[PDB]
Design a protein around this ligand. Structure first.
Ligand SMILES: CCCCCCCCCCCCCCCCCC(=O)OC[C@H](COP(=O)([O-])OCC(O)COP(=O)([O-])OC[C@@H](COC(=O)CCCCCCCCCCCCCCCCC)OC(=O)CCCCCCCCCCCCCCCCC)OC(=O)CCCCCCCCCCCCCCCCC
Ligand SMILES: CCCCCCCCCCCCCCCCCC(=O)OC[C@H](COP(=O)([O-])OCC(O)COP(=O)([O-])OC[C@@H](COC(=O)CCCCCCCCCCCCCCCCC)OC(=O)CCCCCCCCCCCCCCCCC)OC(=O)CCCCCCCCCCCCCCCCC
Ligand code: BCL
Ligand code: BCL
Ligand code: BCL
Ligand SMILES: CC[C@H]1c2cc3[nH]c4c(c3C)C(=O)[C@H](C(=O)OC)c4c3nc(cc4[nH]c(cc(n2)[C@@H]1C)c(C(C)=O)c4C)[C@@H](C)[C@@H]3CCC(=O)OC/C=C(\C)CCC[C@H](C)CCC[C@H](C)CCCC(C)C
Ligand SMILES: CCCCCC/C=C\CCCCCCCCCC(=O)O[C@H](COC(=O)CCCCCCCCCCCCCCC)COP(=O)(O)OC[C@@H](O)CO
Ligand SMILES: CCCCCCCCCCCCCCCC(=O)OC[C@H](COP(=O)(O)OCCN)OC(=O)CCCCCCCCCCCCCCC
Ligand SMILES: COC(C)(C)C/C=C/C(C)=C/C=C/C(C)=C/C=C/C(C)=C/C=C\C=C(C)\C=C\C=C(C)\C=C\C=C(C)\C=C\CC(C)(C)OC
Ligand SMILES: CCCCCCCCCCCCO[C@@H]1O[C@H](CO)[C@@H](O[C@H]2O[C@H](CO)[C@@H](O)[C@H](O)[C@H]2O)[C@H](O)[C@H]1O
Lengths: 57, 280, 255, 318, 42, 54, 55, 38, 55, 42, 57, 43, 57, 54
């Protein structure tokens, strides 16, 4: 149900600064989420799956 | 919005990196390449601090996890990790936040350089800010490297880093006798005296007694000659204040840099070279 | 008897109340210049909305000037002044680009307000900043070279002229400007000491701010024996425009 | 490259300034001013003249007595041996009276000299305060300097007089000596359960660090605009120039807000003054109200907790 | 006006604003429905 | 009923930018707070514990 | 009172609105945080069940 | 702002505030039924 | 006094109103926090019940 | 006169201010009555 | 024992600054004295009079 | 005379390119999460 | 499934400036990822594979 | 095929100097990293321990 005149937001919000803002925020957010998940039981680097490589050595 | 005299200074260019790509303001803030880069480092570091508070030292379900502002602490790794990256939950989070902090600080200083280039002013402020950054880097990079472990850094906690300072200091029995520390403190105290004198003098001549006109350069000089027989001068007090504040930071960095890397015994005993001179 | 509330806790809370009151006081004082803000919100509102933030502006204070110089008030209503530049992009927050020759645009680091058209005065009421020709009681400190007669070079090492006099502060003895007789047009122009490096053994003054040929357009003094605040700002700002404008490389970026 | 305006490359000279004329009742100034070339490299080359009326003469007399009593006692403590006085100088001191004497005037041989030096130094400082007050009055200036000086005097008085009197003993005051007053500083924190956990200690540190932050910022800001005459802050305050505009815009663009040429000096004044106000309050509360700052912080929920990796059996329990 | 917008301009922005806000709140209730079904917290 | 006239009073752009910034911060704050609690869904070993696989 | 509307001739309606919004949000965050610091805490009360116990 | 403009703002301001207070009461009535605190 | 209204000829009503509002808000937060730090605390008194108990 | 209000404007602001302040004090008294009934503190 | 020309004190001291200062001083004094009294045996908030409300729950 | 400098036609043109690009980005995000859910479901 | 006027992004962002930003971001990201991986069981420097070179002496 | 045009849009000299500064820093970093691991070749007592030799 998007408004037909939703495009007019770019008459209020500048394209270049919004684009920069989104890229910066998304880069931070992806780095944050990876580090949050890595510090939990969902950690996929330290789970010795499929094998522990410090164990085989 | 802009200060009512600001628009005639908002010029294009003077960037070090980025050019037109990031050459714009956001409200009052100038952005530029180092604004974008610094913003990412800053937002990441802060959010990792909040994440570290969220899980605490031993997990979010333990009694040690806390959002109490004084008690939150994100700590460096055990000394046994040496110069390697620890696991995130064993001090690695502290290490990533440290890299974010250094990048945020250095990006802040380079943004300041771009602003000086736009305004055609001297570079004294980013030069001076570099001394604070240098002291931070002595604490988390130079001194840890010389002793062989990133775990010699201080923890990121409002009160927990005061525990670090206390226990590092008393490793040397009586840290007050550190000679570079005595010199640095002398600069900190002298700077505070000088600042109160300077602030007072400018306010007392621009806000004179009722019925008096604004006072003069001759009044400023006369006033301290009358009290101490000397006036350093209105330009030179700013030279002096900058010299004292930067000297305080510089001798700070020196005093912690020698504590461990270049001296391991008590600090009073350092003064035995003096006591042992063959003069007395 | 035991109580959670204690005097240390009471006193620290009392300090926070004082401190936040102090900050609001200080932020009001901070708004005695430059406010209300120039915004695009005040433009479209037809001036109805004044942007001042929080706290609001203080009531005006008065500065009574000596020697019957008049009264300055702060804050004060200041007239808009046209900007000799065009926006690089129409988006808000974009920079502007100087019209014409940048050195001469009065825009960017070439810019400055219009200070008053009278001189700063000594306590006794004489013009404060004057050439050594006028203040004959001044001399060069023994041990230091006399700048008079030294050759002035621009950022590219070319000869801009010769130092014809030295302008001193009679209130607090120090050099404030060198007077340069410009080779190209034989005019005598001020050069701020802040933009001057001495090469003592060569008897040369080096000026990084501008090229030798830029000295021809340094703003001129109405009266050769004194300088008004207004002219001081116009002179210093002209050199500073060179820091960004005097060569192409100075625009940046490095990479 | 550019001139940084750190050192004056070419000094000029003029006949020494005798000073702004003072109103009737002030004594004539004394001293024939001289010029120092090397002081003239960093600042003003003129030394002198100086004002000296009754207030300052009395101040200096009290202060020399106090200083001489200290030095005399230091030398006596190495049995008049001037060579050993130089060897041990940083260690020597004039010691507060023993606890058995309380607040009574103690014997000359065991604390009377400390009490006299503290009395006479204190009167010397109080008279110096009056001097700073009178010197502003005679020039028609406001009293900002004496108010800030009073804040420092408050802290000094708390250290050596108010707290010792409240606690019932001159033995709880500060010794006169280099390393001895550092011993006292560390011992005070030990005795009162770690001064890091005193909240007015924390504030005083914030303001001491803040004072160096602000003078680095302001000192550097003014030198970066000294090319526009920004060091002449009186006329930048009455008649805003491009120095003051560029200074404010540097900071607004950096950190989002800014002050004025006048009001930065108000920020600086309060930051420095609050350093010693909070310091006085912090010491004033130690021993009188709070006996152990760490346990006060535990009680109010502030002290961090750590995983237990070392611990010790209490032999007083066993 | 104080924003400068005409009366019809405020009616136009309001229709898009209110529509967009209601959509966002609809997403919020749906998320809180799924979360209540997966992990009730009261 | 005349509530649309709020955009004759409060600047629509600044209200918009304020709402976006506020909501993102609030969203980050709430996820953190819940993750500090028993409700934590990342480190609860549900549906299984993946470190118990290694 | 009847002339109470004249308060918007005294206090700026635009500034008052913005102050109310800012105060209310800060107050709402403060009150939730205070309540969560007490016995009334509804997030870690293991009600209706302890979810960490399910693991 | 004019006199009639103050009347118009005040009427809309009061209805908006009481509605807000209405939500607060409902939120607090729900909270009392779930977790009475007095 | 019958001419006490003349206090508004010397004190700015806009400044007094905002100052009263600012003072009252601070005072209210201060008093609540004081009472919470005494026996009168109504949040952690486990009245009517302790909610952390159920768990 | 020193503020800018007329002698009548000061009489009018006083009337509304006093009725407003007495109303606020009424809310305070009711709240303290309810507090005394729930938790007498003296 | 009241002077008739004491009203002339308002020809000497600014009436507005005096009234402002009086209100500020009284508010600070009132806060101070409440805290002093609270810090003594007269403490009325944390005295378990009429009852201890923590001992109830 | 818009605030950004864009005409109405330019806003329409930018909006259509912005929406397609954001949808493509969200599409990759959904694929990433479907793969993550198949490898290591977390609820 | 891209857009045929995606090249118009270079009418909004200065292309030579975007190049420098990408390169320095990618270097920094590469530095981070090597560090994170080194912090885990996947560490290839301290795994004693093929041999432990400290135990050879 | 048109890669040489990079020097039509980026300054050749400052690209070079960036490369030199980056490479040296990277070299010190990598030597530091290797030395802090099992691959350390200075304190591995290979081919022999010169200290234990005295
Ligand atoms: C509250 C601030 C926000 C207010 C607001 O509405 O802002 C909207 C305002 C826009 O409003 P507008 O429509 O333009 O209206 C004009 C303003 O109203 C213009 O209004 P204004 O001119 O009144 O605005 C100034 C305002 C706006 O300024 C800012 O936006 C930045 C403010 C940052 C505040 C930092 C506070 C730090 C506090 C640290 C905690 C310690 C506290 C003290 C503890 C004890 C210390 C002893 O700043 C402040 O109001 C607070 C400044 C004073 C804080 C001083 C802290 C003192 C600490 C003690 C120091 C020692 C004391 C000595 C004695 O600004 C923005 O939107 C900023 C946009 C965000 C840009 C971010 C991206 C930047 C990228 C580059 C940087 C990368 C990093
Ligand atoms: C106080 C006060 O009355 O300030 C009014 C004052 C009004 O400025 P003005 O010159 O009358 O208006 C000029 C605007 O162009 C005039 O613009 P306008 O009047 O059309 O205003 C449009 C806009 C104006 O919008 C704003 O005021 C700026 C909003 C800041 C960003 C929102 C939060 C970001 C994430 C946190 O109003 C709104 O957007 C209403 C919603 C604002 C909600 C902000 C909620 C902030 C809560 C932050 C705590 C939560 C933490 C995270 C959870 O705004 C301020 O300057 C605030 C300064 C704070 C000073 C702190 C200094 C300490 C001493
Ligand atoms: C058990 C706890 C629950 C959980 C319960 C909730 C609840 C309840 C909510 C969220 C909401 C969000 N959650 Mg969650 N959430 C969980 C785990 C996750 C994790 C993770 C790594 O575990 C991630 C990264 C997220 C991410 C998110 C965001 C997508 C969203 C907040 C957006 C915002 O702040 O808008 C701020 C930005 C704006 C307001 C800008 C304007 C809107 C623009 C146009 C849209 C932005 C993106 C939009 C939200 C798209 C997402 C819709 C999806 C269908 C979710 N959740 C789990 C499994 N989560 C919220 C949400 O989805 O709101 C609809 C929400 O109400
Ligand atoms: C046992 C301890 C008691 C308690 C006994 C008291 C007593 C006694 C009083 C309060 C008062 C207040 N308490 Mg309490 N209070 C308790 C618990 C709470 C808790 C909580 C989470 O537990 C909350 C958030 C509150 C909140 C409040 C506010 C509603 C009010 C302070 C407002 C103010 O300072 O005005 C400052 C703002 C202004 C002056 C602006 C102008 C006023 C405007 C026009 C009115 C705005 C709406 C107004 C706040 C509506 C509330 C009035 C009702 C009669 C409650 N109390 C408990 C259970 N509380 C006070 C009060 O109600 O004042 C009448 C008061 O006298
Ligand atoms: C068990 C956990 C899972 C895992 C589950 C997920 C899930 C689920 C997701 C990812 C996503 C990502 N994962 Mg992962 N991830 C895992 C392990 C890895 C590892 C690793 C070392 O283990 C790496 C390095 C990554 C890396 C990545 C990235 C490719 C991506 C985040 C991109 C981003 O934030 O852009 C930031 C966003 C932007 C910059 C905006 C979009 C960019 C567009 C395309 C155009 C911008 C161009 C612009 C002009 C220039 C940009 C450059 C600038 C100069 C900086 N993952 C494992 C195995 N991962 C996410 C993804 O794929 O997104 C689709 C995602 O949804
Ligand atoms: C060298 C003399 C002194 C000095 C000078 C100095 N500092 C300066 C400057 C100068 C000239 C600036 O120009 C710059 C500035 O802009 O000031 C307004 C700055 C500054 N000095 C500041 C702080 C500060 N300076 C201090 C000290 C000093 N600065 C000296 C004593 C201290 C002390 C003594 O502790 C602090 C706290 C900031 C106000 C500002 C730099 C602002 C900045 O870099 O912003 C970017 C970063 C953020 C917005 C936050 C980053 C968050 C991180 C990514 C995560 C946090 C990690 C951190 C390591 C955790 C620490 C936790 C615990 C220790 C509590
Ligand atoms: C060094 C001493 C300089 C000095 O001693 O200068 C003297 C003047 O002292 C005078 O005014 C008075 C000079 C006294 C001031 C000396 C320096 C004071 C300290 C300045 C620094 C500030 C103190 C620290 C502040 C934190 C020299 O003049 P006379 O003694 O009169 O004799 C000269 C005869 O030829 C007269 O014909
Ligand atoms: C622990 C308890 C708290 C401790 C705090 C101690 C503070 C006092 C110690 C320092 C002494 C300073 C003496 C000099 C003062 C001075 O000089 O002020 C005068 C100068 C003005 O002079 P001028 O230059 O304009 O003109 C000179 C021509 N005569 O500056 C100031 O107006 C600064 C403004 C004062 C600060 C305002 C603080 C208000 C707090 C309000 C809190 C409200 C909360 C309400 C809660 C219910
Ligand atoms: C031999 O020496 C000669 C004569 C050549 C001169 C040389 C002198 C030298 C070398 C002196 C060296 C001095 C040094 C190194 C001093 C170092 C001093 C330091 C570091 C002091 C630091 C702090 C001291 C403090 C804060 C002391 C405060 C004491 C106070 C405030 C006491 C006040 C006492 C009062 C008001 C007493 C009143 C007496 C009453 C009224 C109570 O009597 C009943
Ligand atoms: C100018 C005069 C100023 C007067 C200043 C007075 C300010 C007082 C503010 C008090 C701060 C609020 O304190 C409120 O009370 C209780 C104390 O019973 C705190 O309660 C907590 O205190 C401590 C510290 O963790 C615990 O040991 C205690 O068991 C616990 O209940 C609440 O976490 C807090 O919400």
């Amino acid at each position: 149900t998007m408004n037909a005149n939703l495009y007019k937001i770019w008459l209020i919000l500048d394209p270049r600064r919004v684009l920069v803002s989104i890229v910066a925020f998304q880069i931070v957010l992806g780095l944050l989420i990876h580090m949050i998940v890595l510090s939990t039981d969902l950690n996929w680097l330290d789970d010795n799956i499929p094998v522990s490589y410090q164990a085989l050595g | 919005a802009m200060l009512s005299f600001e628009k005639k200074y908002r010029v294009r260019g003077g960037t070090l990196i980025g050019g037109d790509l990031f050459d714009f303001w956001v409200g009052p803030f100038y952005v530029g390449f180092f604004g974008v880069v610094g913003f990412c480092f800053t937002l990441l570091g802060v959010l990792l601090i909040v994440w570290g508070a969220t899980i605490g030292p031993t997990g979010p379900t333990s009694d040690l996890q806390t959002y109490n502002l004084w008690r939150i602490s994100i700590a460096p790794p055990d000394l046994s990790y040496g110069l390697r990256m620890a696991p995130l939950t064993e001090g690695g989070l502290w290490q990533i936040i440290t890299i974010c902090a250094a990048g945020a600080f250095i990006s802040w200083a380079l943004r300041e350089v771009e602003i000086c280039r736009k305004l055609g002013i001297g570079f004294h402020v980013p030069f001076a800010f570099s001394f604070a950054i240098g002291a931070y880097l002595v604490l988390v990079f130079v001194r840890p490297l010389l002793m062989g472990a990133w775990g010699h850094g201080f923890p990121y906690g409002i009160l927990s880093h005061l525990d670090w300072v206390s226990n590092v200091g008393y490793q040397f029995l009586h840290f007050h006798y550190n000679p570079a520390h005595m010199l640095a403190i002398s600069f900190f105290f002298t700077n505070c005296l000088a600042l109160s004198m300077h602030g007072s003098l400018i306010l007392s001549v621009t806000n004179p007694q009722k019925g008096e006109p604004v006072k003069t350069s001759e009044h400023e000089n006369t006033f301290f000659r009358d009290i101490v027989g000397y006036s350093i001068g209105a330009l030179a007090i700013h030279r002096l204040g900058l010299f004292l504040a930067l000297s305080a930071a510089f001798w700070s960095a020196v005093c912690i840099l020698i504590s461990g890397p270049f001296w391991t015994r008590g600090w009073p005993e350092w003064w035995n070279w003096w006591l042992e001179l063959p003069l007395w | 008897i035991t109580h959670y509330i204690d005097a240390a806790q009471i006193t620290i809370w009392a300090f926070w109340l004082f401190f936040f009151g102090l900050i609001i006081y200080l932020r009001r004082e901070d708004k005695r210049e430059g406010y209300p803000l120039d915004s695009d919100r005040t433009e479209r509102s037809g001036g109805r909305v004044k942007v001042v933030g929080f706290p609001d502006l203080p009531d005006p204070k008065t500065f009574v000037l000596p020697h019957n110089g008049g009264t300055v008030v702060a804050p004060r209503v200041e007239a808009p002044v046209a900007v000799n530049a065009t926006p690089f992009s129409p988006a808000p927050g974009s920079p502007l680009v100087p019209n014409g020759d940048p050195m001469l645009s009065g825009f960017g680091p070439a810019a400055s307000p219009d200070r008053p058209k009278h001189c700063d005065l000594t306590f006794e009421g004489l013009p404060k900043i004057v050439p050594m020709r006028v203040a004959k009681e001044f001399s060069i400190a023994e041990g230091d070279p006399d700048p008079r007669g030294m050759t002035v070079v621009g950022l590219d090492g070319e000869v801009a002229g010769t130092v014809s006099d030295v302008w001193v502060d009679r209130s607090e003895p120090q050099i404030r400007y060198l007077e340069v007789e410009v080779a190209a047009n034989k005019k005598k122009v001020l050069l701020p000491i802040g933009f001057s490096r001495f090469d003592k053994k060569a008897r040369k003054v080096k000026v990084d701010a501008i090229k030798a040929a830029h000295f021809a357009n340094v703003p001129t003094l109405s009266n050769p024996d004194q300088v008004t605040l207004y002219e001081e700002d116009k002179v210093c700002a002209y050199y500073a425009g060179g820091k960004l404008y005097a060569t192409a490389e100075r625009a940046g970026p490095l990479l | 490259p550019e001139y940084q305006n750190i050192f004056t490359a070419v000094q000029v000279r003029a006949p020494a300034y005798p000073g702004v004329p003072l109103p009737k009742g002030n004594l004539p100034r004394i001293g024939r001013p001289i010029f120092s070339y090397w002081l003239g490299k960093i600042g003003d080359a003129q030394i002198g003249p100086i004002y000296l009326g009754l207030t300052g003469t009395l101040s200096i007399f009290f202060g020399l007595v106090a200083i001489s009593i200290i030095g005399f006692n230091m030398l006596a403590s190495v049995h008049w041996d001037v060579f050993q006085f130089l060897k041990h100088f940083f260690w020597l001191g004039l010691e507060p009276p023993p606890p058995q004497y309380g607040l009574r005037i103690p014997p000359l041989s065991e604390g009377g000299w400390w009490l006299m030096a503290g009395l006479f130094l204190t009167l010397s400082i109080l008279l110096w305060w009056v001097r700073t007050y009178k010197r502003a009055e005679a020039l028609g200036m406001s009293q900002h300097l004496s108010w800030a000086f009073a804040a420092a005097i408050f802290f000094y008085l708390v250290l050596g007089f108010i707290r010792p009197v409240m606690m019932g003993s001159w033995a709880k005051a500060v010794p006169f000596g280099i390393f001895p007053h550092l011993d006292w500083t560390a011992a005070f924190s030990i005795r009162y359960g770690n001064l890091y956990y005193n909240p007015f200690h924390m504030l005083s540190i914030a303001f001491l660090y803040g004072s160096a932050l602000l003078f680095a910022m302001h000192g550097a800001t003014i030198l970066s605009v000294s090319r526009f005459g920004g060091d002449r802050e009186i006329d930048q305050i009455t008649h805003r120039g491009t120095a003051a505009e560029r200074a404010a815009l540097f900071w607004r663009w950096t950190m989002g807000f800014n002050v004025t040429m006048e009001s930065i000096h108000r920020w600086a004044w309060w930051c420095a003054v609050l350093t010693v106000i909070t310091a006085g309050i912090g010491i004033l509360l130690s021993g009188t109200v709070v006996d152990n700052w760490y346990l006060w912080a535990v009680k109010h929920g502030m002290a961090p907790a750590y995983p237990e990796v070392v611990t010790a059996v209490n032999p007083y329990e066993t | 006006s104080l924003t400068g917008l005409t009366d019809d301009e405020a009616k136009e922005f309001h229709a898009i604003f209110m529509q967009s806000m209601y959509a966002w709140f609809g997403l919020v209730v749906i998320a809180h429905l799924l979360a209540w079904l997966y992990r009730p917290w009261l």
